Structures are given as C-alpha cells and as structure tokens.
Design a binder for this molecule. Structure first.
Ligand code: NAG
Ligand code: NAG
Lengths: 73, 116, 404, 404, 76, 401, 73
C-alpha cells in the first residue's frame, strides 16, 4: 500500500520507495524427532505388510548410512 | 502540493473578449498538457480546449462550439495557461475549469483522462 | 551487479553446530526423555543453548503396539495395511528428499515439517509477537529461508535439525534501485560512449546505516514486505541515498560502469519500465486496447505502468508490472553529455564518479602537456654550416653576413 | 559472457495481471457459471481479455454426491476409501508444490497440468496449426518454459493461472558460436598475450535482424530445434555475422577480450572440439578403438567428431558430441600474431576490434612522437649566456659581434 | 538433421549452422479451476476402521484447502 | 571467481553415445535376452563397448501373469499400485526434466540397485568402498538419460562417475579484499587474491577448481569435477607462502572499493573491516571478545562462535583443527597509491608491476626529453629581416647599427 | 582425521589443508531396463474393477507419455 516510484533521467535510473523491511539477521535451530521401533505363513494381506515393513527397514538403514557422513561445508 | 487556480472570470458583455488564466503549481508545467472544460448552469460538462506539451509541438485543439472564437495558449516561463475568449455569446455563461491531461504513460501523446 | 563485493559465509554452520552437539553421549536421551510425555518441549543442551524439540512421527508406538502382536501369523483386516502405508509414507518421502540432497534440503518441504508443526514452532519461538505474526503469515517464505540438516538416528529415535530464520529487522523503510545504460545518441557507429549506474539493488535502513543487496534476485518480495538476507549484503553509510538525487555529490562517490557498447535494452521496474533505445533499434510502449502509444526516440526514457501494458525493445516484448502506485518523472540533462568522448575511459567496471574524473585529469595531462611536445619539433633550429665565417638566422635559413 | 548487456524483465507479470483481475468481485462467478456444463470454456474478463478456462478436478461433485450420503455413519465398501484417496492425492501434491515454491512454480508439473489437459490447451489455443504441431511434439520443453501462479481460492473454487509460451518465430535459421582463447606460443612465461571472442552464444534470424543469446546454457535444444527465450536476448543487426568470416570487417566492430592468462582449455562444440594448449600442458585427442591419434601443438586447434571420441587437456577429460554432420576446418593466420606485445592492451573486458586498434594507435602516437622527435631534435643549438651582447653562430660556436 | 559446423583458426572460434528457431516471443495465460465443497465437520462419532481412515483423509483435504487459503492470503 | 577461465564441456556426451547405440535394430534384443534369466548382466554392444545392465521392475511378468487371467479380492488392487507407482514417478521426473535428470533419484535407482552397480563396476576395491560409503554424493554426480521404449521394454542409461584420482592431498584457498586504511574516503586502494577455490594434487600437477560451490565435501573427503578444473603447475602453491615468487605469477584483482566484509573459512573467519564499519568477533557465553581494527584480520573458531561485520552476522564453522596465524606486512602497503592500476580483474603481480613501470616510465622519459628540451634556441621570427641571438630572444640584426 | 588451517596476513588469505581427493575423472554408462507388457485395451461395472481399470489407464498413459518423450534424445 501507498507505493511510489521516481525516475531520474539525468542518471537513467529509477527508485521504488515505499517498502517495509523483513531482513533475516540470524538463525534458530530446532530438533525434530521420529521415534523408531527395533524390529529384527502367507495369507492374502501378509505379503503387502511384509514388503511395507521392508520399506521401513530399508529407510532406516539408508538414513543410518546417510548420517554416516556428518554434514560439512 | 498539486494545484490549479483559474482566474479572470466574471461579468462580460455579449460580443467582447475575456481572458481566463490558469496558474499551475506542484508539478512540471512544461512536460504536461493542459485542457479547458466548462459547465453551463444546469447543463452538463462540455469539453472546450486542449494544448499539448512543449515536447509535442504546442498543438492547440478546440471544440466545434468554440473553434475560431476561443484561443488557448501557454506561458511555460511562468507556469500559466490562458484561454482567450473572443466574440462571446450568451451561451458561454458557465463555470470554466482548468484541468491537466494525463498521458497514457509518464509521457505520451495519447491521453487517458483528466488527472487534476 | 556488485555481487563480487560480497563476503562468503557458511549457511548451515549453526545447525551443524547443534548437530555435532547432538552426537554427544546422553544428549539424545535427554530429548527422548523430555518428549516421553508431550510432543513438544524446550530443551537446554550440554553447552547451555536452549532449542525447541518436536516429535512429529511415532512409528514406535505403532509398529510395537498396533502391528507387533499380529506378528504362524495371519492378517484379519485390510484397513490396517492402508493405515500402515499412510503412517510410513512420511518417513519414506523424508528419506527420498535426504538421499537426493545429501542430507541437507532447502526449502523445507511439507514432509519435513507440515504447516501445523511449523506454525506451532513459530508460536513457541523466543521472539516477539510481531515476529511470530510475520513468520506465521508468510510460511512459504520461512520455508524458502530455512534448511533441514539431518543429524543422527540413535537409540530407536530419528533426529534432524530445522534451521529457522530470525527477522531482527522489521518494518524499516526500503527501496529498490533499477539502472540502465545511458549512452550518447550519435549517428556514427562505435562513436558513442556509455555509462551505467552499478549501485542497483535493494536498500534498507538498518541501525543508522543502509543494508545493500546487489543481487535483487535473491531478495523475496511479498506484498510491500521485502524478505532479504544480510548474508548477501553490504553495510553502507546513509549518504549512499544521495546518489539518487545528486550523483555528483561530494559526500559519497557513486559507482558507475563505462563502455562503448551502445545496445538497446529495457529494465522493468516496480511501477513502470526504463527503455534504453540506441542505434537503429525500434522501441515502443503499447496498451492492450488501442495498441502502440509511444515510439521511443534514441536515448534512455521512462514509461509508467499507468495505462501501459507492454513495452517492446527490438525483438523482445516485456510485460510491465501492473502494480498500483504513483510514478514521478524527474527531468534532467543526461550526464553523459557532460563528458568529452576523446578522454572517456571506455574500459571501466568497478568504477565511480570521481575515479573516472581523475582518470580524465590524467589524460588531460597526457595530451595537453606531453603530446603537445610535437609543437617543439619544427619550432627549433638546426646547426649552421660549419664553414669559414658566421651565419645569422633569416627567414627559415642561415643566411651569412652579406646583409652586413 | 555478455550476459550483463541484457535487460531486466518480469516473467509472471502477465499471469499476475490476469490473477489480479480474478480478485475482482463477480469475476469468479462468471468463471464458475461458464464451466457449469462442460469442463473447459473460453471466458472474457471485465477488461475484455479473453482467456481459456479449464476445470481439471471436480471434488465438489464427489464429496457432496458420492461421499456425503454415507456420512449413525458407517462405511460399507473399502474400495470407496481408495477411490477418494486417488481423487484427493492430486490436490495434496498441488498444495505441496505451491506451499514450497511460494505460490509460483516452474516448470509446470504433471500434477498441475496433465499431458492430456496440456495438449487440450494447446489444441484450443488461437494460434497457427504449425504452432500447435510444434508445441504438441515438445510438451517437455513447453513445460520447462511455462509458469503456474496460484491465484485465489474463493467461493468453493480453486484457481491458478498457467502461463504458457507463445512461439511467434519458428523455423528461421539459427547458429551457435563457440569461442576459446587465442594466445601466442612463446617459451617465456609472462611474455604471452591472449585474445578471446566474447560473441559466444546462440544467434537466430528474426524480423530482419538477429536475436543474440549470450547465455547459451538457458537455450534448450531438441533435435535441430532451438527453444530460446527473447527475455534474455539482444537485437543485433545482421552484420554481426560478418565477425565469423571477417573479424576485421568495417561494418561491424567485433567484440573481443584481451588478457595475459595463457592457460590450457577445451571447448566441446556441436560437431567437434576446440583445444587451446598453452605452456607445458599436454593435450591429446583419442579414439576408443585405436587410441591417441593427435598430440596438439601449442596453440588453438580443432578436431572434428568424425572418428574421435575423447579429448584430454591436462588432467581434464572431455567427451565430444557424436552427432552426425560435416565439420569444416578453415585455415588462417591467428590474429594474435598480428599484434605487437609492447603496445598490446592486456587489461580489457567488454572491448572490440576497433577499441583495441584505438589504444594501439594512441600508444604508437606517443612512441612515434617521442623517439622520432627527440632524436631528430636532440641535436639542436644551445644559446650564449645572456650578457647583454648579441652572439652570431660560426663553426658550431657562438662568437660575439666582432665587427669594426 | 542436415547440420554443419565450421572452425575459424584465425579467431579460434566455431560456428554450428543448420538449426531451426523456436523463440518464445510472448505469453498466453489460462485459468485452471478446481471446484471444492463446503464441508463443515465430519458430523460422525463412530470409531470403526473404515470411518477412521475416511475421516483422516477428509482432514487431509481440509488442511490442504486451509494452506491454500493461507498462501492466497503475488510476485517473485 | 576465475570460473571464466574454464572450458566448456558436454556432460552427458558419453551417455548419449551409448544412448544412440540402443536405437539400432536388435541391440535391445541382446539386452532383453541377456536379462531373460537374471536381473543383472554384462552386455558388450555392437561397437565392442561393454556395459552393465539391470532390470529393476518387471510389469510384464505381473500384468501378463498375475493380472491378465482375471481380465480374460481387493489386495490385488493395492499390489498393482505398489508395483506401478515407480513407473509413474519415473515418468513424472522425466516429463519435467526433458529426459535428463540429475541427481539420480531413488525412483530411478534405489540404494540397493546403486550399491549393486557399484559392486559389479570394473574398478578397484578402494573405489568400491568410496562409492559405497558416499552414495548420496555419487547420485549428485550421476545423470539419468532416458533412451528408448522399444518392443517391449523401457530403457534409460544411468551415467555414473569414475574416480580415477583418490587419496591425493587437497587444500582450499579463501581470500578477501586487502585495502589500505586512510581517513579520506576515495583515497584507499584495494587488492584481492582471485585464485580462491579448491586445489588437489593430480599427476605431478595441480587440479584447480575456481567454483568451490560445485565441489562437495564429506568429512575430510572432497569430491570435485575435473570437467570444470584447470591443470596448473606444482609451483602454484608457492603463491600462499611467497606471493612475490618469480617462478609463478600469482593472480590478483585491484580496485578502490574498500567495503567491509567477512569470509568464513573451514576453521575460522577472515574480517576485512574498512571505513567506519564496526566488526566484532563474539562467543556464545562471554559475548564480544574482539573488536577488529581497520584492516584485514583473522579469528580462529577455537572459542569463537559468531563474527559480526556491520549489520551482518556470520556463524563460524565449529570444526576441530589447529589454526595458525602467519604474521606479515599487508602487501597493499608496498604499493604507491598514486600509480596503482585500480581497474584490474584478470590481473597478476607482474602485470601490476609492469603497469607501474610503464606509468612511471612515461613520466621519467617525458621529463628526460622535455626537461630540458627548452635548453635549445627556437626559430627566429620568419619575416623579411635577419635576426641575431641576444639573451633568450632573437634581436633584430638591423640595430647594428 | 587431522585438519589444519593457516592465515596469511600479508595477502589476506587462508589455506585449509588436510583433505583427501575424490576427483571425477571419467564416466561409466549402465543401462537400466523396465520390461513392459503389450496390452491393447482394458477389455471388460462393480467397485473393484473400476479401480483396476483406471490403474491400467495410468499405466497406458505413462507409457504413452514416455513414447512422446522418446521422440527426442
Ligand atoms: C622486462 C623488462 O625489460 N623489464 C624492465 C627491466 O629490464 C628494467 O631493469 C626495469 C628498470 O630498472 O624496468 C623493467
Ligand atoms: C585535477 O583537475 C582539477 C581541475 O580540472 C585541478 O584543479 C587539479 O589540480 C587536477 N589535479 C589533481 C591532482 O586534482
């Protein structure tokens, strides 16, 4: 709201006044947690639940490999 | 800041001459174009005259009702715009307003409305 | 433009610091014991720094309780299968995003932190109500200015750090500067000289000085609010603003860039368009209903968006921003006419007004003093004939002593 | 290289303008009423602009008709749950893409617009049949050049603008110019001087002129078709092409860049590879079956892809493109040999051929004026000491007036 | 297809001729709509399995529309 | 900084080469017959090049076997979705990225499949170990070019990286502007080293990467890319210990823009505090522990957590290591500000010294000829009469007598 | 490991020593295959068939889009 703009022909330039600042000055760190489960006869449904548990265990294994290399820049 | 003050009105006998003068203060007068619009008592608005900026030739455009009788002019040295009314009729009794024509951009010979 | 003048910083350094703190022994158990009751808490680490903690997913209390007793086995209902899929999909998607971005993702996706969780975290952050309001109304910007660093997965718990931004400067006046080449308009080719203001970008008042952002592409703008990052800034004095009203001010040396490349271009501003039309290029400004409403002459001119929809330079068609605001045209002689093209430095990038004027002072010395030594070539005399008698200088020769 | 010579434009300005038109009262009701029968229609807004309109998903007639009556409540079919999930997943993913990218996404994803719907929009767009053909065969490129601006979600409808590209110039001849440093091949270290053409990028014929794209990385290629964007282009005269056949042509002043950094490099071209091998660097060209087939001499040379598979410069290994076509090698004296290293300006960015010649003519002016004038002049005549007596010149000496 | 290329040794440059143009000169805007339904609340108190799944799917729908309303509440 | 000195290369040029080979007739059948038994195989194509081959999803043996007879329970629906979702997502990733995607997503190649490809790769065990422990980085350095969908298989080539140089010493150079500290505004001159970026020993020379943003770091390991590198002599390292060495002309960049900034290094922070800017270095418990004076200074991360320059707050990296401060006079003080070339980008030490000798040459030579070129007599007035020499002027000879 | 760093005040620069190389020198190409089934049309109005039919529609539309994508390299 209530924005202006000026053009200076002498310098071939333009200034757009009327904005409000929202500068990011610093950071704040937050820790997010996801609690996992320590998991070590074929009916109709068990095959799907078994491969879904396989998805879960492979996800936690891949994350175990990923945290292996602590981030650094 | 932006102001247009017209002066020179009043009583005048039918057939003589009277010069209206519009003083501009608040913006660049040379870069902008001026217009004269009158309103008869009880009647609607009637567009009368128009003079373009110095950059676009100083071109005077009049209406059919006053063409040949009225003459628009401008004095950019003192930021003023004149409307010379010659051979006045009784129908010319009206309120005369001074307006500024707004170009389709910051500067253009195509105008979209009367700003001030 | 002046992005090379910026410093070099580490973005995730803070989150990685907290990460290395989370590797320590017992540090994870403090969090697991703190969130054993509620889902959100505030925890002070070993080094004393207090950080927010959140438990967004509990597959432990699902696999170990709702799924474990069934596992000879047999599943009785199918609804539990889809329920497990819905519970596990989030972990799967988080794993994908991490395995692609090497453990650090930005912006923060909704899988990493949903809007409900993000707004809760903003509500409990140790900042003002104004800051909570700002971060809550612009969660898309907070997501784009945040990182997600994966930390550790120890003791049956998964942990990753969300590096959130802190807006320490709010509601101070800002302005964006746009620039374009200002060249002469001669007819001969390559005879033109060009000059361009280089100080273009965002400026914001901050702590008695000005924060300057040369790469305006990195500053995000929403409504009249400007979310910039001080990491990509320069701390300049307030007198920089003088360059807009008086480029020849003595209190600040305004930065320019000189050349001889007179090409036509256009810079779309917030409320209009700047057009630099040089050479045989055709530049126009048009309205969607009537059509062309201005054909630009050779030079740098401006056109407000009030009634103009497009601006075309050469084969390029620009759509101007249709933002509502007042545009003011400030007359003035193009400063390039104040210069002599014979001593104009045409190779200047990191330049300034005074730096170019001093490079002109030297050339004026080089030509008016040293080159005028050519005048002393024919203006001096050769040796008279080494003959018997003496010679006098008459006309342009040595004509002896008959005249005697 | 010359990307700084470009202008600054607003990409979504048109879509944002249409978006702000949709915020007005009643406009949403006009759209809602037009699509009450069919799923796609053409609607002219208040400002007269006619735009295509599409309803891609109808959750209203699913939740209220097929889902509402079941909600005592109990679900009978389990298939209806999965049916609702399949219907709702698209809205969820659209929400994710918008909430991450701050409401503006590019390229346009398949969730935002499927292939059938995109081809429907292309088929119903009011442009030529050739444009329909071009956009229909290259939907991946059209997606890469399109935007998706989220507009409003008012009165039981969701609305976002899909800003599609218009290819007004099709099937005109284009060509890609590749450049590489051209340095001398002296044995001393710092004695070398370098020169490089900056005109690298894409060129296309357009409306009696040439559209030049200096950042060729932004131009996408499919088969022999080049999808560029005029937004980052320059309108040059046709005479720019002369720079390929005659760098010293008078009708166009070709842009170059001088330096002294003689480092070895390679530029993989469309049908071959340019190799600038300077110093002790070892540069070779090899075939996957036979092995090394050329050891480059010091200088800038070329190798066609006809029978060559890799080119190695130093420790860098490049794979050349195996596209089918003819490569032509045009011999010629390297122009860097035409320059004298004592008057060669080495600090030059954003230069031209005549711009180098002007500084060379200037340096030779000071040299031909200094050494040719000081030597021819050096043997002049001193004067006799000012002692109120007039001296005449005889035998190379000044003798007083000895007459009586 | 029938593509050429030339190398100029004098200037150390290469030109790849034989391509066809496809320049983007202008834009075209179209409005895509998704009709939504005004659902106040899942006015059901049951706790069986299928209602348990369908209610949380409706909650996903409602949170999605709330986020879209917050996002609408542009330029880059 | 020096990224413009790099060459231009075609990245997927190798993969596309294999890609067009698959377009030939029968070439796809060799692969389909090789993978008819197992899921992974080695195939030597027509051009003799041997490539690994992998079948990650078989919808043929599902749709034609488990799904077709019903079309000639509800679980069979979900089973199909789980099998089909990958084909959809692979499609989506392609349809956006125009057939070439990077990094290689998990849909394109899962971790198990990628580790299998690394295990059967024809390279050393050390490379297998390196690629297996850093699969996220390998994905970021790999491409996925979609090739063909021929009767009746879908095919895309995954272009994997080969690390021919491993375990050689590397080092990262950080630079920042080095200016004088005068009180007047425009009176200062600035100088900055431009050779900043990554360096690694390679084949008796040094591979230099000016765009360190492209080099990825995990622990003390640096995955760089030779395609955007420079092969420099071993002597380049001398520029760090002896900038004025004659055996290598170190590259610098001159200016007059004395602005304050900071460069966060691996174990510390460089602070260039010029002008009236206030620059500090602070600790999370103690607070401000150093107020920088005008100039370029350094502060290690040993006990420092933040560094603030002006309105900018930087967090320094809290990595463990020994940081050593090497004293020395700032070389910018070795230059005279009256003859200093201030517009230099692609510059070096010898180029600046030669422009100073040249600028100085013209002044001493112009004075050596002009001072004094007026020690000689000029031309007498060129009228009719004759002129003799008296004092400094040409006196009319007719005055005698 | 054992990482060091040095700061040179004379040139205002810093060198971070102690890292190991892992340079990408060359490429290696591998072919991934996904065998498809030649199904002409869903030849078949209960609840479960509707889902399996539109899932087959997803499959056929995916292979059709890949056919359009393959039309360029
Ligand atoms: C390459 C070259 O000739 N450099 C010269 C050097 O020989 C000379 O001694 C010096 C003046 O003392 O000026 C410089
Ligand atoms: C520069 O020029 C000004 C005026 O042209 C003159 O007064 C001055 O002496 C010159 N030299 C310096 C070093 O300022």
């Amino acid at each position: 709201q209530n924005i202006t703009e000026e053009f200076y022909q002498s310098t071939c330039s333009a200034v757009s006044k009327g904005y409000l600042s929202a500068l990011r000055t610093g950071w704040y760190t937050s820790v997010i947690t996801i609690e996992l489960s320590n998991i070590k006869g074929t009916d109709a449904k068990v095959k799907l639940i078994k491969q879904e548990l396989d998805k879960y265990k492979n996800a936690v294994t891949e994350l175990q490999l990923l945290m292996q290399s602590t981030p650094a820049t | 800041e932006v102001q247009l003050v017209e002066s020179g009105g009043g009583l005048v006998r039918p057939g003589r001459s009277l010069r209206l003068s519009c003083t501009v203060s608040g913006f660049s007068f040379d870069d902008s174009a001026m217009s004269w619009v009158r309103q008869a008592p009880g009647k609607g608005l009637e567009w009368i005259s128009f003079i373009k900026s110095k950059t676009y030739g100083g071109t005077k455009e009049y209406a059919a009702s006053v063409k040949g009788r009225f003459t628009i002019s401008r004095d950019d040295s003192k930021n003023i715009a004149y409307l010379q009314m010659n051979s006045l009729k009784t129908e010319d009794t009206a309120v005369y307003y001074c307006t500024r024509g707004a170009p389709y951009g910051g500067n253009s010979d195509y105008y979209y409305g009367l700003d001030v | 433009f002046l992005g090379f003048l910026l410093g070099v910083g580490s973005a995730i350094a803070s989150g990685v610091a907290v990460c290395k703190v989370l590797h320590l022994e017992g540090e994870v158990n403090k969090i697991k014991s703190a969130l054993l009751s509620t889902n959100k808490a505030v925890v002070s680490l070993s080094n004393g720094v207090s950080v927010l903690t959140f438990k967004v997913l509990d597959l432990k209390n699902y696999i170990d309780k709702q799924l474990l007793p069934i596992l000879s086995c047999s599943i009785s209902n199918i609804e539990t299968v889809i329920e497990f899929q819905q519970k596990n999909n989030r972990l799967l998607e988080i794993t994908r995003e991490f395995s692609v971005n090497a453990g650090v993702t930005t912006p923060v996706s909704t899988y990493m932190l949903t809007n409900s969780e993000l707004l809760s975290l903003i509500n409990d952050m140790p900042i003002t109500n104004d800051q909570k309001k700002l971060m809550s109304n612009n969660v898309q910007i907070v997501r784009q200015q945040s990182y997600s660093i994966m930390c550790i997965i120890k003791e049956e718990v998964l942990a990753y750090v969300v590096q959130l931004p802190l807006y320490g400067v709010i509601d101070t006046p800002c302005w964006k500067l746009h620039t374009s080449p200002l060249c002469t308009t001669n007819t001969k080719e390559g005879s033109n000289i060009c000059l361009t203001r280089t100080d273009r970008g965002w400026y914001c008042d901050n702590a008695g000085s000005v924060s300057f952002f040369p790469q305006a592409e990195t500053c995000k703008v929403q409504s009249n609010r400007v979310f910039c990052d001080t990491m990509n800034s320069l701390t300049l004095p307030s007198e920089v603003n003088l360059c807009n009203v008086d480029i020849f001010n003595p209190k600040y040396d305004c930065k320019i860039m000189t050349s001889k490349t007179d090409v036509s271009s256009s810079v779309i501003t917030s409320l209009g368009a700047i057009v630099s039309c040089y050479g045989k290029t055709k530049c126009t400004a048009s309205n969607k209903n009537r059509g062309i409403i201005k054909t630009f002459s050779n030079g740098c001119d401006y056109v407000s968006n009030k009634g103009v929809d497009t601006v075309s330079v050469g084969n390029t068609l620009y759509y101007v921003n249709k933002q509502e605001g007042k545009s003011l045209y400030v007359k003035g002689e193009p400063i390039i006419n104040f210069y002599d093209p014979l001593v104009f430095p045409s190779d200047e990038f990191d330049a300034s007004i005074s730096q170019v004027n001093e490079k002109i002072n030297q050339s004026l010395a080089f030509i008016r003093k040293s080159d005028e030594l050519l005048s002393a070539i024919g203006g001096y005399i050769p040796e008279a004939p080494r003959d018997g008698q003496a010679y006098v200088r008459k006309d342009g020769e040595w004509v002896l002593l008959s005249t005697f």
